[PDB]
């Protein structure tokens, strides 16, 4: 509709029920240009108030071990020394 | 004859165009044929021919803008240009203009249909020659304006001079000489082709379009105006002929290849042989030349 | 946003790209037939003021927003039928307003706009929720009571007083 | 805060990583990141005979969101330690 | 199924006849009478990319748990429509279980849409198909997507010359319908310029009609407010309306 928002709140309205079971997201990347493999998962987050941490667990294959087993990262944003060099 | 085949075929060979390429440009057969790549371009100047009143209007205006989009995309200028040109020349067995499409081709002709009456076969020498100067246009590399002065005023560039230039392949030697400099004028171009057009182009104002010293620029012309060259070259039209340019910029040209600035190219230049005037040179002249 | 049109004469040999249209002559320069097709305006708030800002602040609290419905071009579409005094009346009434282009040019006209998608914020001291929302002025808002965290929204109320509210 | 670092654990000041420890948004909401450092609990003394130190790494334990007191400003300034 | 699409379902219905699950889920076409009895539908089997390849008629069955897919396959008499799809996602060709078949050729600027008459030919192996034989419906598009011409053939034999029927349509700046011409009312407008299309439509920045004419009905104008109720109208016999 347009001259209307769509960020209208108008109703309190119920959720259905029933429907076809999707299960977990289970995202295998499209990659393209570095040819690795990648997964990622979705995690159980509260949406809460609407600003909740932005985590997922991903796997890529070339990732080297970690807090959650050989492959997945944490995706926590940091900042670090470069040492490549 | 080998040294006119010298002079275009070296040319030929370093603007990239094969013999086939020139002789579909230079040909003036004109093959009277209505084929689609011909029925074409008739099928819409009609357009022009019939929303337009002729005796108001003038052709140039009404037809450049439909040969615009059979033509490949040749803008009103160089369309207009296009026309104006085949008008002069008359590229055809005989006097073969845009007028003679507004009394048979948009009356007789009957649009859609090659059955008419037989005027539509000059219409068609017409229409291929105009295809010719476009191709031209395109394989010159010549600027919408650097081009519509050589049917503007062909006089100055040595081309058919009581008309619009024919495709004669010295001709368009030297119709590309002037395309190629107007490249080399660069974005100064437009000033240039203006002051040029008009008889305000001077030394000093080309050299700064040409990059140039401009003293070299300008005893080039002095040098240009005191040699009797094919065309005649006074200071009056030194920089109004493209001829006259040409002159000079050659005396430019041979000073910056021997580097002696343009006075010193003619001391090397009066140093003759089996000369027919019989002026026989002196050693003065030979040692002033070598010195 | 602008339209223009031009013939299959037009397309340079090669296509267009960016070189040619940024181009002074080109076929988007200036002094061509631009139709107009529309424009959009964001209104920002405060939260305090019922004046829109120069500017957004912080939290980008859009107030409404703003969208041309007619030209002066495109009222000729009423083919008449109605007085021209009657109709800038009509569409006043109608909640369109006139107003200048965004992005202007020499040789032009006000055109009419409508105004909507309005919300009214709450402070920051609650989290900054919208408290009231309207498609329009020409209707009442709908009140939005927020739970005692500003989490979910308990309780609805329209223009009307009709009330309607959830348990989570 | 000590446990958004990871740093060399003697030249404690020589930081590798600054790991995310807090957040705000525009609208007053926050976010606070609770890590645990590494210890020895669950290692036999093999582990800790080896690697005497080894307390630099830092693992992600709590995320604390949904204030519920609205602020602009960051919840992780002045060190102050999360409460649920 | 795994991605969350559906498989079947089905509905419990009074006690009567029902095809037969079998105890590896296999079915069987031969109907019994049974208490316990479900109307399966919405039977569907997929490519794995979600483009429903398979679809099933309807049929009655003795259990609510679902029937076995090699079997479905294999049994014939459980009917179902085939569809295949082109790289683009496009439906190319639907065979029906009667073996007729709907197909649709794409090109840059047109669409050719054969119905099962069309095709009757090709699967030959009533009305005689030769009727159809090159009859498509062609939908021509612009060059911004737009449909500006529907062409259609017109035969009353099958041995006739098809003739060409085509319903033209322009559209305005903003891809809004302008225009629409009816090919009886086209070829005499091309005779005679005096004759309106017929229909036009005038319409807001935001592509609400203000106007519309027909050539069959009149002209109305009408202006709705702000929020797309209306205001104001006038029919075409004057009548106004606030």
Known sequence: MQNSQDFSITELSLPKGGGAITGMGEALTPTGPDGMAALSLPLPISAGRGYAPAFTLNYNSGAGNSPFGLGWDCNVMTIRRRTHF | ?291 | ?168 | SPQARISNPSQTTQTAQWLLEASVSSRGEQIYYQYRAEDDTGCEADEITHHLQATAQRYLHIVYYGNRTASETLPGLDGSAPSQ | ?242
């Open chain 3, 1 to 168: 946003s602008d339209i223009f049109t031009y013939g299959a004469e037009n397309v340079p040999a090669g296509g267009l790209n960016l070189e040619l249209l940024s181009d002074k002559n080109s076929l988007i320069a200036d002094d061509k037939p631009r139709e107009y097709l529309g424009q959009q305006k964001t209104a920002y708030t405060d939260g305090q003021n019922t004046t829109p800002l120069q500017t957004p602040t912080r939290q980008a609290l859009i107030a409404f927003t703003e969208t041309t419905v007619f030209n002066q071009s495109t009222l000729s579409a009423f083919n008449g039928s109605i007085p021209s005094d009657k109709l800038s009346t009509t569409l006043e009434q109608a909640g369109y307003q006139q107003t200048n282009y965004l992005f202007p040019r020499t040789g032009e006209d006000k055109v009419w706009v409508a105004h909507h998608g309005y919300t009214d914020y709450g402070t920051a001291a609650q989290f900054w929720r919208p408290q009231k929302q309207s498609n329009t002025q020409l209707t009442g808002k709908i009140t939005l009571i927020w739970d005692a965290n500003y989490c979910v929204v308990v309780q609805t109320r329209d223009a009307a007083g009709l009330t309607t509210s959830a348990k989570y």
């Open chain 2, 1 to 291: 004859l080998i040294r006119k085949l010298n002079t275009i075929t070296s040319w030929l060979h370093t603007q990239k165009w094969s013999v086939f390429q020139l002789f579909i440009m230079t040909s003036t057969s004109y093959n009277k044929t209505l084929t689609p790549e011909i029925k074409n371009l008739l099928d819409t100047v009609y357009h022009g021919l019939q929303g337009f009143d002729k005796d108001k209007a003038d052709l140039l205006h009404v037809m450049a803008p439909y040969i615009a989009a059979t033509l490949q995309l040749s803008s009103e200028n160089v369309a207009h240009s296009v026309l104006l040109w085949a008008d002069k020349l008359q590229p055809g067995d005989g006097a073969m203009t845009a007028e003679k499409f507004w009394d048979w081709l948009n009356t007789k002709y009957t649009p859609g249909s090659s059955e008419a009456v037989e005027t539509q076969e000059h219409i068609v020498q017409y229409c291929q020659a105009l295809a010719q100067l476009e191709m031209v246009y395109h394989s010159t590399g010549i600027n919408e304006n650097a081009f519509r002065l050589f049917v503007t005023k062909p006089e100055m560039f040595g081309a058919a001079t009581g008309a619009a230039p024919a495709h004669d392949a010295l001709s368009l030697i030297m119709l590309t000489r002037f395309a190629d400099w107007v490249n080399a004028l660069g974005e100064k171009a437009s000033s240039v082709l203006a002051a040029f057009e008009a008889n305000s182009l001077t030394a000093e104002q080309l050299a700064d379009a040409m990059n140039l010293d401009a003293n070299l620029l300008l005893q080039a012309s002095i040098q240009a105006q005191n040699h009797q060259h094919l065309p005649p070259v006074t200071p009056e039209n030194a920089f109004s002929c493209w001829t006259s340019i040409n002159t000079i910029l050659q005396w430019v040209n041979v000073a910056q290849q021997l580097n002696v600035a343009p006075q010193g190219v003619s001391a090397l230049v009066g140093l003759d042989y089996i000369e027919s005037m019989k002026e026989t040179p002196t050693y003065a002249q030979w040692e002033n030349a070598a010195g």
């Open chain 5, 1 to 242: 199924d795994g991605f969350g699409r559906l498989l079947q379902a089905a509905a419990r219905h009074e006690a009567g006849m029902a095809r037969q699950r079998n105890e590896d889920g296999s079915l069987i076409i031969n109907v019994q009478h049974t208490e316990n009895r479900w109307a399966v539908t919405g039977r569907t089997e997929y490519d794995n990319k979600g483009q429903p390849i398979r679809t099933y008629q309807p049929y009655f069955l003795n259990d609510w748990r679902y029937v076995s897919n090699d079997s479905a396959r294999q049994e014939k008499e459980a009917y179902a429509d085939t569809h295949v799809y082109d790289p683009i996602g496009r439906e190319i060709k639907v065979i029906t279980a009667k073996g007729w078949f709907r197909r649709t050729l794409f090109t840059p600027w047109f669409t050719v849409n054969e119905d099962e008459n069309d095709t009757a030919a090709e699967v030959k192996k009533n009305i005689d198909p030769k009727l159809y034989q090159k009859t498509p419906t062609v939908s021509v598009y612009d060059n911004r997507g737009l449909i500006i011409r529907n062409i259609d053939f017109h035969r009353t034999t099958a041995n006739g010359d098809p003739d060409t029927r085509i319903t033209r349509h322009q559209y305005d700046i903003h891809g809004h319908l302008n225009q629409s011409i009816d090919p009886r009312l086209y070829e005499a407008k091309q005779t005679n310029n005096t004759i309106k299309p017929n229909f036009l439509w005038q319409y807001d920045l935001t592509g609400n009609p203000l106007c519309t004419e027909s050539i069959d009905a009149g002209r109305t104008v009408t202006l709705n407010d702000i929020e797309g109720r209306p205001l104001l109208t006038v029919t075409a016999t004057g009548v106004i309306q606030t």
